[PDB]
Amino acid sequence: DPKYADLPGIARNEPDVYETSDLPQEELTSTSVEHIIVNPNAAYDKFKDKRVGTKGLDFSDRIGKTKRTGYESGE
């Protein structure tokens, strides 16, 4: 009796939850495009020590020479 005789206007006997009952791609047939089985370390060893050098790494839309192709120095 927290407030039974005290206050007769407070809720009880209420099942306000509203229940229910327990009642519970890879079309590779085509020949469209391949994939590669990821192995980050394999590709890491693939691109292992490419000493690419960026001498004059310029790719602007400048017009003053013949052509521009950076990422060119090697070992």
Add this chain to the structure above:
Amino acid sequence: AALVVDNGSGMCKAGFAGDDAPRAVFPSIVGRPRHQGVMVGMGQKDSYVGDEAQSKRGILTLKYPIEHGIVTNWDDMEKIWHHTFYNELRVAPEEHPVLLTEAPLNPKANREKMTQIMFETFNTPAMYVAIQAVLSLYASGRTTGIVMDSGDGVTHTVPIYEGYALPHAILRLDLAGRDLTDYLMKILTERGYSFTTTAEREIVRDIKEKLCYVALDFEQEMATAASSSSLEKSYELPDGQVITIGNERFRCPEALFQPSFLGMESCGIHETTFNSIMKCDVDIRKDLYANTVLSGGTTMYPGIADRMQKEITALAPSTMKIKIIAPPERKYSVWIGGSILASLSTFQQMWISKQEYDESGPSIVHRKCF
């Protein structure tokens, strides 16, 4: 020769080719009275319709048979139809091809069902249904023009160019003054007035049309109203009550510019129309400023033309010369355009006969109605 019947969820009209005034003019709403349980004598009609229902509006409840194109019951709609025919013209449908209208966004099954029953029930020789906007610019006098429909429950921006147009360019929001009627009725309820039945709706739509003028900036207008309440005009109803409103009057159509009054996650009529213009050619958009054609029955309110003009004026550059075409008769003009359409023999060579549905079925409805 023909059978011209303009339609509308409210205003439904009729007559024939060459006629300038629609013979049939009535509210196309379905009235359902208070059928109670105790006995009574001498009876009445099962459910009076529009004018029939308005005559005895005290019991008859004119609920909507359509909802922004969503026809509730085809049966009741036919009752409206049949009685209207045998109320106004009293002519059989086998006389001439019929003429009716519709608007987009409608599932093709509705227009198919429509025409299907039109041949079923009526067995007309031929028939035809079109788009209101076509008759609008058709009666206007252009093949290149952007208009917008503001009926009782519809809104749609139609840009045309030499007759050509694009469905992608034509935009649509089927929202209109009925929503405003709801908004206005509830805010006046907040003011302290009772509103339960459909007669409440009728009186408020009445005074709504009687007071929805268009001012410019509600901030200063509101400031002047609170300052001087002289704008708060009074009006005595059929009942002894006399209400006084000033803001309410013109601020009710401001929701057309702002969905914020209803919180609709939408855009203003002006910017919506602007985007419709944006779906075009840079040259023809200029023509839209030139062909700023206006329609819709809920555009019989003074001031908004200058408003929308100023809106797009702030939107479009100064070089875009605005040329608003504002016909104050656009409401009836669709029916009139239908009559003019019914006057061009070539169009009356193009038809939808019996055998088309009898054999072809309803696919010709998709490729022949428009």
Add this chain to the structure above:
Amino acid sequence: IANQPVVIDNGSGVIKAGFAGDQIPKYCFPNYVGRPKHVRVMAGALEGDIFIGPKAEEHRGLLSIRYPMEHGIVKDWNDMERIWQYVYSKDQLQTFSEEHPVLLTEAPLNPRKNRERAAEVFFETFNVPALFISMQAVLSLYATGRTTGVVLDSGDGVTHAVPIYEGFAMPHSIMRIDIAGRDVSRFLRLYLRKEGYDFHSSSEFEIVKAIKERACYLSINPQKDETLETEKAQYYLPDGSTIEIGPSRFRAPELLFRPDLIGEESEGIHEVLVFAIQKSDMDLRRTLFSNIVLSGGSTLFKGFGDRLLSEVKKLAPKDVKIRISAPQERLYSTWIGGSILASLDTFKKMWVSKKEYEEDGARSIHRKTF
């Protein structure tokens, strides 16, 4: 002053009050109007027969009781003056307006004039140092502890459904129809009118109220129960009126869910309810269908929750079951929420200082009303 503030509550049928810390409102005082039945032959009597509780139980000769706030719609205020005045009098809480701040709620969908008049009393006549006005369902939520949930409740003459998630609710999504128990009492006596009994004044109305809340229940199959057979038990008044009732003892859902069968224009709690829920976010709607706060101080009958479940089953997207919530007593939850409200930091940022009222009043009332 840092005393315990007065927490006045409200109610169309049962109005409450209290302090920030009371766990029980000391008086379960109903909302009514004590008056004389005839012109008192001798002057200098119990002026207006302002009677409360035992004073109302004192005599019955020249005593006509009414309501000063019909179904939440309050019209006059002199009765309210004396009622509040009696509360202010040192028989209720033995305190003053100035001695304690006052918390109070208000029913929605009301004109501002009500708020105007009340604040005029509370600051002009009586002097509240810090007041406040709020809602009711919010307080009920605080009592239940939920801050979310489809709130639903129904007072003595006011019914309302408010969809809520974290307190948020759209006014468009908020629905309310003010019709409950008082008219049920009117119809109980109307049932007995068909049965031929005593019908002269409010005394019988009191009797019928005692019946309604005492010698009345609600069944589930009115067609079956109407076609069934009972011997119709009776009651004993101070006269000992052994009167039989029958179906009329439980003919109330034809007022709750089907009041239109009394040739009336309404919908049904469940209908308007579900519609308001449908105004929300469909998926959030689905989630909140599992948590629908059900309440109501008048909805105190067995089986009616099952009838509501039947409405649910007819309206829920089937197999998404929603069982019965059966809260028996629903009164003080609002009073409890107000006690918890004023007991927290809330009123400190939510008061209405008398000074600010003196400065602006209605301006401050509505600038701080939300």
Add this chain to the structure above:
Amino acid sequence: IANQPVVIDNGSGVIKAGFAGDQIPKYCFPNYVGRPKHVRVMAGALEGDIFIGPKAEEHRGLLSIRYPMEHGIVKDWNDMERIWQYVYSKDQLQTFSEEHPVLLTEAPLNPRKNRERAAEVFFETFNVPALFISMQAVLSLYATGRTTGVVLDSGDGVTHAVPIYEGFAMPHSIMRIDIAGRDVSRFLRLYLRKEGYDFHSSSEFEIVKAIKERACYLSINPQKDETLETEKAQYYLPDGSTIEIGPSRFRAPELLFRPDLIGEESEGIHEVLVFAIQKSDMDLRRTLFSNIVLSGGSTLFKGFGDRLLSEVKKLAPKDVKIRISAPQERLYSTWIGGSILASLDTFKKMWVSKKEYEEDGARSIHRKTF
């Protein structure tokens, strides 16, 4: 070093981020901004109004979606600032921008101004030690290992094909057109509009998105399967609704090849791809058929590539050898290749020294980047 390079996988639809060596997907999330939608005063609610995540993908009717990104180009950079702050969260980042290197993705051919504004934030507001941004195509190729490559892909708004071999960029050979999934949603909605199903809200938009990545498959025959008779089995919706299959689901991606039906002219994805092949050389063309690219998460469809291969049959001459996968995660693939890329030795030269950005900035990066 503890300062692990922060990989950022920003795409149109799919958007992510990452780190070097940490192969596995860190944190997935969508590409928009979540604004609040309604008000209240009641306690028991979350505030901040910038809501992204579970509450965003939970309280859809309480938060609106904001896409400042238009085909990979954002207009309101402050939204990205908030997005990046959501990234900066120590529930998301747990670190500081100024303490770690940063790599980022970008679709090519975008205006430099975007990059400028981006780097302004990325260095001025956040003194990031190292930063480099590149093409997702490159990252994908690094993930593959083929020096060759014609990256054909689409996010949710951009079609693009990148022919390359050993990193050799022929900008005249590379092509793109801003179109993908956003219009797929729009066209889905268009069919809904054709059948009366208005789903315009931000919440409604995600519902359509669920339909998109839920109710879809294909057919190698356009009209041969289009002119037939469907079945349209209904499907249960997250509201409790159930709507038909519709042939439209597979009809929608054909708009990618027939955009004239939507109105704008284009050529055909595979056609522009062939044009790139034509811009290449005879010898390399054989390798082009040998070197095919599985890219774009939108491509997830049944018999997708089958139909595209048939188009190739209709275009390319004989002796065409094209083959297929067993794809793992076409999406993450790019980001993964970038993570491995971020885990490289000589990769240190690829960034931008912030000090140089202070000195010159953008233009120097533009010339240093491709």
